């Protein structure tokens, strides 16, 4: 002791958190577009009529 | 803790003085015993009626209570319910111990231990 | 991450720190005494009559 308690330092305990990909596995296709917007076209053709 | 200090200044890293305890060459005798109240380091202990290690105090009741005799110098601090090892023999320093009030001078402190293995003497 | 409109400058995120732990060992002293009361009597691995 005396003026101050001596020490030995052991190694730093680094817990590192992550957040891995689970919902991105159904989003495989990548588009890097420089335009403004993305347009879609959905068409239902009901045929089952007597 | 958070911020540094940018300005110029001074300060002490610390200061230290040794604490000498022994004054002679008598043999050292120790025993642990169950404490009864708060006990500092190198405070003179007594024993109460129940057999616990109450720290020493004269002027106790009519009848001189068994707290009036003093038995041992404690060695390491403890609380009520934590048993204490204490010295029962040796020749000790006069000033490094922990006394209390009305027991100030050199003569009364040796008159505490006029008989035992423990002897109280000055350093030089 | 914070959503910031592409005109304005953007938000500022804070950080964190760290802590410590210090420990100190205990100390142990068992012992014995060896008087002549424990040397003199017979150990079991010894014949009868004489020793």
Automatic annotation (TrEMBL), chain A:
It is found in: Virion; Host cytoplasm. It comes from the Viruses. Assembles to form an icosahedral capsid. The assembly is primed by the interaction between capsid assembly protease and portal dodecamer, and major capsid proteins assemble cooperatively to form the procapsid with the help of capsid scaffolding protein. Major capsid protein forms hexons and pentons of the icosahedron. Viral genomic DNA is packaged into the procapsid through the portal vertex. The packaging triggers a dramatic reconfiguration of the capsid shell. Belongs to the lambda phage major capsid protein family. Homomultimer. This is Major capsid protein. The chain holds residues 2 to 51 of 354 of the full protein.
Automatic annotation (TrEMBL), chain B:
Pfam families: HDPD (PF02924). The lineage of its organism: Viruses, Duplodnaviria, Heunggongvirae, Uroviricota, Caudoviricetes. It comes from the Viruses. InterPro entries: Head_decoration_D. This is Putative+head+decorative+protein.
């Amino acid at each position: 002791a005396g003026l101050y308690t001596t020490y030995q330092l052991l190694e730093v305990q680094r817990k590192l958190k992550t957040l891995p990909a689970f919902f991105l596995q159904w989003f495989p296709r990548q588009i890097n577009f420089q335009e403004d917007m993305i347009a879609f076209d959905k068409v239902i053709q009901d045929v089952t009529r007597v | 803790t958070s911020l540094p200090n940018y300005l110029a200044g001074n300060g002490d890293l610390g200061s230290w003085e040794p604490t000498q305890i022994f004054a002679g060459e008598a043999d050292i005798v120790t025993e642990g015993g169950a404490a009864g109240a708060d006990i500092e380091i190198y405070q003179v202990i007594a024993k109460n009626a129940a057999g616990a290690m109450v720290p020493h105090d004269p002027t106790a009741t009519e009848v001189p209570a068994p707290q009036s005799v003093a038995i041992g110098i404690a060695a390491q601090p403890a609380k009520s319910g934590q048993n204490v090892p204490y010295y029962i023999g040796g020749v000790f320093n006069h000033a490094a111990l922990g006394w209390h009030a009305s027991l100030d001078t050199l003569a009364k402190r040796q008159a505490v231990f006029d008989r035992t293995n423990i002897h109280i003497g000055n350093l030089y | 991450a914070p959503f910031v409109a592409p005109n304005v400058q953007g938000r500022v995120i804070k950080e964190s720190g760290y802590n410590t732990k210090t420990f100190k060992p205990a100390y142990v002293k068992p012992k014995h005494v060896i008087d002549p009361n424990m040397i003199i009597p017979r150990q079991p691995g010894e014949a009868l009559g004489t020793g």
